[PDB]
């Protein structure tokens, strides 16, 4: 669907409504400017053909006709300026209003809108959709009107000069319109066809580049490479056919134009010889009507662009038309004055609109008084965060009524209520400004003294003092520059600066140490006496000193009372407390050196295509020189027939040679792009995981490099050799011939050819539009939008949208002025290079009359020099426009050859190394330090050590991100540590073979990822370089207890699975990951988070195959669920990388340490 036309120009004022009307009138005038030139030129050639009478008064008459040409030139100068300037100004101002209103509408949106609509889609639709609207209401509409005016002027001038000859053109004119329409529609950046061809291979590229570590883990690079190559060859085939047909179309356009010349002259000489028309009358009519018919097709991309703009405006306007159910832009709600903390919930049933079939809540009733510290305890899934979100009115409850000190929310203001409730969420985000602004983000008017007070209440002033720019430090994106503890404490301060009336903490001390959490809680109890408070966390240290503790079960608050009340109640909380106690190099031709025959044929055909322009200049001059000589009717009839036949033969040659040049260069270019994509992708795969770490080149840079290199390198190689050759042939022959024929006129015209060529280029660039507008500026503006869509979760709490929209507008204020000036400049350059042609006509034919009068050259020679040098410098402009840039192509080639010759640490195709015939299975790590390359200043390990024997079920337990999967990567050769020693059965991994190690063991990743194929080819990814038997495919499925969910689906072993397994559930993809690794039969096995999303009955059937297969092979399981940790052989707890405790489980349970506190979570 698409908008109306009245609803596209919705943001148009009286000033924008004037610009469009006057630009439309000026475009009509500009349009009619050219057929009048052909009328004057036809009338002028009769002054030169009847000049010599057996030359007096030739220079007077050429003076008058120079005035005519210069008057038309001035008229077109003024009208073309007005046209382009006024349409680009109307579009610019309107697009500005649309950008602002679109973003302002995105801000006033219900929560969860972003979950429904991905935020890369919002951030991309923003820019793409506004550009797609801008294109259609800009100068494309002016060009449309200009071409309709040219059409009508052409046919009126035609029919007025002579109707008999115009009717014949009009009979063959629809074919001309179709030829031109098809040509320009094909021409309007036919690049999306290549994107549509490469879409599927890009899908494979994005799959493999989402799970690079996984594919490297299984070692199956070759399989994914075969897949990419198959997709690639398909796209290559489609491209070859597209080149064939596009070039056939250009060829038939040229054939039709030339055979039209042939017919026009064959019948026009019949009319001239009969005495009815003259030769000027025939030139007038033929050129007027031909130009009108071609101008109708020069306006076909405008209807396309307008349809696309209409389509995109529909989406945007629909986004800005919806009004959510809650919005801080409505002042209807009443603001209270005497603020008193009181919470009343009663019969509160609520469900998430994202998944409304499930009901987490089934009514909660609660009454909380002022200052009453209420804690809520329960497992993750009851919805503590759901209650926190329910509080601030992020949603509305489906049943009941909620109230805060008497009256209900549903009749009072959302903004006022939102500001007085200081809330901290589970995972805070921090804005990438200075920290002073971050803490200022509480409210508007906060001075530095209050800032210091709040930061000293947060006890986060030490790391403020040790780091430079103590109030000027720009924190990185998503709080990466500082640590987690500092970040959470300053987030607490950021909440406190608002001076709230109700405080709501949710997991305020997730990764916090002892003394900082203690001082934080002391400060929290320093500012709780005037404010209501609700705290949600896991640590029971900051819970025992509360007012009232409650307990969630199935969303329902079941237990109520104080501490001793739930002690004597002996419930789940009693169980809890009972258990707790730079350069650029040229090698681009060597890349394409295998396809030499295509280039030989292509350069030959390009030489001919360049020569076709002077040949036409010569034939045209000679036909018009048949009627300036004093010959009989038989001589004129025979010579006219000869030259009309020559027009036809030149048409056929043009058809063949255009087809051939296009086809051979296209085939060579497509072979080059397929080979380049293949080689680059194979090189990417052969890079280890350490190269991919770089945030520049992890996901987007590589896929954009594939889809950019493809086009660019064929651009350089084909453009250079074809355009340089075609234009050398064309202009060189033109200028040499026109020098031997007349050298004075040639020297005069040789000063005007630059402007004619560049005029062609500026016009064609106007036809293609603008690829990029205000790039730097668009970055400056879109950074704000990115950081405002990413931090939406936080910013709806902070209620700082207004203060964010103003930042957006301020960021827009520079590109706006820049764009209006750019329009006023482009209008001038376009109008001047358009009028230059009329002035060139005038100057050349006044000089020509002078020469002819002094008998220094003939008329036919003036006409030949003019046609070869001027009619044939426009062609240089067109050809040079159509060619793709060489600078971007050459830098792209530099990057491609960098990636191609790129040499990684270890070679994947290297079998060299220690290859023992036997192994033992014992591993030993000692004093092993690991620092991430991306984070060289932050150490995650401190020289850990381990000892592993055969069959030893070694468990690893710790906090999140403490070096859990680090030991996994440190075994699987992803990272080699700077210091340490790793003995694998007395064999150091650095001297062994690199594929053998990765071949012997087998693991399950943290998150299961499956490939775009059936489940059969998902499990048969585990064993490669080997013939997989289906009896092991069903065996591994029965063993993993997925055989039931396979044998149930239609096309059981050929059911096509979505990307990452988005079709089936998390438990099944976790099982089929267990079965994917099960077929490996590894002598060393690792498990990371083996029971993340799995049922309780499914864990026993998963582990039962593990327990029976644990024997013989070393086993290492890392999980959070204690069930697999109790039965393990030995357990190793980590703390910031350091091995704290190690030994048998009983020895760890005898001496109570930190592991005892880990066992004390929920048992009893």
């Amino acid at each position: 669907p698409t908008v109306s036309v009245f609803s596209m120009f919705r943001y148009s004022n009286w000033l924008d409504k004037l610009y469009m009307v006057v630009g439309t009138l000026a475009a009509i005038i500009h349009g009619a400017g050219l057929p009048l030139m052909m009328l004057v030129f036809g009338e002028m050639t009769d002054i030169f053909a009847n000049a010599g009478n057996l030359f007096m008064n030739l220079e007077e008459d050429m003076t008058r006709y120079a005035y005519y040409y210069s008057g038309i030139g001035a008229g077109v100068l003024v009208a073309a300026y007005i046209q382009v300037s006024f349409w680009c100004l109307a579009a610019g101002r309107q697009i500005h209003k649309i950008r602002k209103q679109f973003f302002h509408a995105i801000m006033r949106q219900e929560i969860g809108w972003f979950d429904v609509h991905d935020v890369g889609e919002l951030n991309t639709r923003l820019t793409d959709d506004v550009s797609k609207i801008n294109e259609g209401i800009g100068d494309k509409i002016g060009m449309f009107f200009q071409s309709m005016a040219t059409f009508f002027t052409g046919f009126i001038v035609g029919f007025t000069r002579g109707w008999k000859l115009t009717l014949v053109i009009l009979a063959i004119s629809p074919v001309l319109g179709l030829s031109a329409a098809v040509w320009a529609k094909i021409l309007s950046s036919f690049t999306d066809k290549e994107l549509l061809a490469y879409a599927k291979a890009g899908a494979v590229a994005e799959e493999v580049l989402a799970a690079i570590r996984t594919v490297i883990a299984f070692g199956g690079q070759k399989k994914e490479l075969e897949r990419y190559n198959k997709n690639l060859e398909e796209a290559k085939r489609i491209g070859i056919k597209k080149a064939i047909t596009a070039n056939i179309s250009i060829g038939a356009a040229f054939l039709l134009i030339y055979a039209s010349y042939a017919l026009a002259f064959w019948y026009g000489t019949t009319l001239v010889l009969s005495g009815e028309y003259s030769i000027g009358q025939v030139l007038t009519v033929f050129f007027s009507v031909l130009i009108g018919a071609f101008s109708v097709g020069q306006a076909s991309p405008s209807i396309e662009a307008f349809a696309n703009a209409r389509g995109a405006a529909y989406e945007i306007f629909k986004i800005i038309d919806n009004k959510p159910s809650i919005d801080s832009y409505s002042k209807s709600g009443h603001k209270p004055d005497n603020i008193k903390g009181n919470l009343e919930f009663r019969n509160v049933h609520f469900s998430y609109p994202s998944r409304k079939e499930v009901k987490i809540l089934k009514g909660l009733n609660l009454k909380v008084q002022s200052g009453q510290t209420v804690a809520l305890v329960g497992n993750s899934g009851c919805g503590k965060s759901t209650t926190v979100q329910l509080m601030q009115r992020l949603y509305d409850p489906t049943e009941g009524m909620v109230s805060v000190d008497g009256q209900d929310i549903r009749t009072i203001n959302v903004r006022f209520l939102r500001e007085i409730i200081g809330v901290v969420s589970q995972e805070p985000v921090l804005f990438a400004t200075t920290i002073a602004e971050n803490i200022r983000y509480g409210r508007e008017n906060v001075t530095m003294d209050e800032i210091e007070k709040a930061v000293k209440e947060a006890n986060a002033y030490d790391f403020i003092m040790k780091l430079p720019h103590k109030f000027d430090t720009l924190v990185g994106e998503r709080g990466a520059q500082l640590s987690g503890g500092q970040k959470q404490r300053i987030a607490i301060a950021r909440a406190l600066v608002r001076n709230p009336k109700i405080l709501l903490l949710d997991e305020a001390t997730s990764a916090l140490d002892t003394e900082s959490e203690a001082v934080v809680q002391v400060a929290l109890d320093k500012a709780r006496k005037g404010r209501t408070t609700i705290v949600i966390a896991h640590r029971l240290s900051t819970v025992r000193n509360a007012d009232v503790i409650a307990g969630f079960d199935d969303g329902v608050i079941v237990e109520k009372g104080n501490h001793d009340e739930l002690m004597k109640e002996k419930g789940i909380y009693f169980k809890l407390v009972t258990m707790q106690t730079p350069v650029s190099f040229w090698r681009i031709m060597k890349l394409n050196l295998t396809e030499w025959p295509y280039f030989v044929v292509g350069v030959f055909c390009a030489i001919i295509n360049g020569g076709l322009q002077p040949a036409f200049a010569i034939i045209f001059s000679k036909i018009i020189g048949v009627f300036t000589r004093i010959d009989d009717p038989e001589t004129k009839r025979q010579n006219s027939n000869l030259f009309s036949l020559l027009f036809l033969a030149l048409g056929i040659i043009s058809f063949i040679t255009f087809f051939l040049q296009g086809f051979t260069f296209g085939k060579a270019g497509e072979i080059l792009t397929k080979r380049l994509r293949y080689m680059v992708f194979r090189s990417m795969l052969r890079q280890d995981v350490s190269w991919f770490d770089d945030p520049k080149n992890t996901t987007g840079a590589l896929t954009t490099r594939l889809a950019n290199d493809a086009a660019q390198v064929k651009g350089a190689i084909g453009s250079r050799l074809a355009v340089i050759t075609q234009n050398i042939a064309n202009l060189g022959t033109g200028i040499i011939i026109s020098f031997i024929y007349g050298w004075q006129l040639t020297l005069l015209l040789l000063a005007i050819v630059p402007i004619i060529a560049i005029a062609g280029v500026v016009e064609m660039k106007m036809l293609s539009g603008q690829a990029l507008k205000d790039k730097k500026e668009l970055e400056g503006a879109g950074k704000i939008a990115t950081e405002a869509i990413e931090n939406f979760r936080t910013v709806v709490s902070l209620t700082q949208e207004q203060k964010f929209e103003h930042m957006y507008a301020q960021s827009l204020q520079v590109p706006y002025r820049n764009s209006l000036r750019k329009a006023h400049i482009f209008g001038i350059t376009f109008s001047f290079t358009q009028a230059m042609m009329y002035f060139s006509y005038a100057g050349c034919f006044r000089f020509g009359a002078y020469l002819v009068a002094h008998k220094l050259m003939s008329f036919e020679d003036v006409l030949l020099v003019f046609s070869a040098v001027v009619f044939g410098a426009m062609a240089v402009g067109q050809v040079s426009s159509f060619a793709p840039d060489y600078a971007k192509a050459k830098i792209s080639a530099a990057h491609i050859i960098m990636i191609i010759e790129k040499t990684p640490l270890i070679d994947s195709y290297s079998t060299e190394g220690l290859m023992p015939n036997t192994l033992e299975g014992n591993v030993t790590f000692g004093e092993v330090v690991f620092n991430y390359p991306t984070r060289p200043d932050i150490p995650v390990l401190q020289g850990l050590s381990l000892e592993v024997k055969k069959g030893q079920t070694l468990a690893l337990v710790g906090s999140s991100g403490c070096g859990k999967s680090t030991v996994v990567q440190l075994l699987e050769r992803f990272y080699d540590p700077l210091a340490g020693k790793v003995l694998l059965d007395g064999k150091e991994i650095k001297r062994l073979n690199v594929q053998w190690l990765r071949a012997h063991l087998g693991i399950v990743s943290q998150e299961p990822i499956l490939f775009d194929c059936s489940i059969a080819e998902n499990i048969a990814y585990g064993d490669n370089s080997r013939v997989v038997s289906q009896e092991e495919i069903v065996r591994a499925a029965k063993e993993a207890n997925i055989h039931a969910f396979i044998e149930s689906l239609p096309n059981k072993y050929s059911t096509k699975v979505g990307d990452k397994g988005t079709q089936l559930s998390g438990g099944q993809k976790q099982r089929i990951a267990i079965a994917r690794a099960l077929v490996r039969q590894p002598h060393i096995l690792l498990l990371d988070e083996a029971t993340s999303a799995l049922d309780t009955e499914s864990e026993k059937v998963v582990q039962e195959a593990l327990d029976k297969a644990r024997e013989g092979r070393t086993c290492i399981v890392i999980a959070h669920r204690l069930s697999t940790i109790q039965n393990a052989d030995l357990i190793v707890v980590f703390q910031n990388g350091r091995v704290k405790e190690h030994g048998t489980h009983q020895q760890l349970l005898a001496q109570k340490g930190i592991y005892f506190s880990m066992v004390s979570v929920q048992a009893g």
Partner: antibody
Amino acid sequence: EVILVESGGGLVKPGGSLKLSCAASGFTFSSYTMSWVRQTPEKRLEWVATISSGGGNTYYPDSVKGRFTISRDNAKNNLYLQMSSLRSEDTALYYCARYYRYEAWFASWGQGTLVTVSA
Amino acid sequence: DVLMTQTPVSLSVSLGDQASISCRSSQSIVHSTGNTYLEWYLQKPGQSPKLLIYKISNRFSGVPDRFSGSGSGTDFTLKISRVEAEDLGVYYCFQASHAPRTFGGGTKLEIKR
């Protein structure tokens, strides 16, 4: 005014080869069709040959084609007629004549040149 | 071939009378362009022929208005009014409409005295 003069006509034995030249001044020779016309001793005019303005097209009557051959030299402004396999009936007075716009065939005649073919 | 035949072979005209010659063709000359080309030439004793009307009823630059031509189809004629002694010679009728160009025989004009 237009001045065409002719030269080269003399007595020739039958079967011989002669060559006539006609020099043209006062107009742009390289723009005009030019013809040779012939007047017999009974005083009956007969067209002989025609050549166009570039030198491309030439037209002869059946009687005389094959034996006669017309050419023009645009640089010296000259018109030539080469004659071979002469006959007694080709004895006559030869005129060069210049073509006229508005389509009249012989606007400006030259003076004669007399050619006799006898023993 | 198309052959022109002129009706009077000799014509005697008193000084001041009117003289009418006619040149009936044989194939009804008309070109493919719809123009019919039929010119009259006058040879005065001792000079080269001179143009006189370059088609049916036109007049060459310099030719008095006494000479007039008129003709249609396949019959054409020339009439002179108020002959003088200066106008005294042989009148030929050339036709260049068909592929061999042919002159007529001629009509000697003789003024009485």
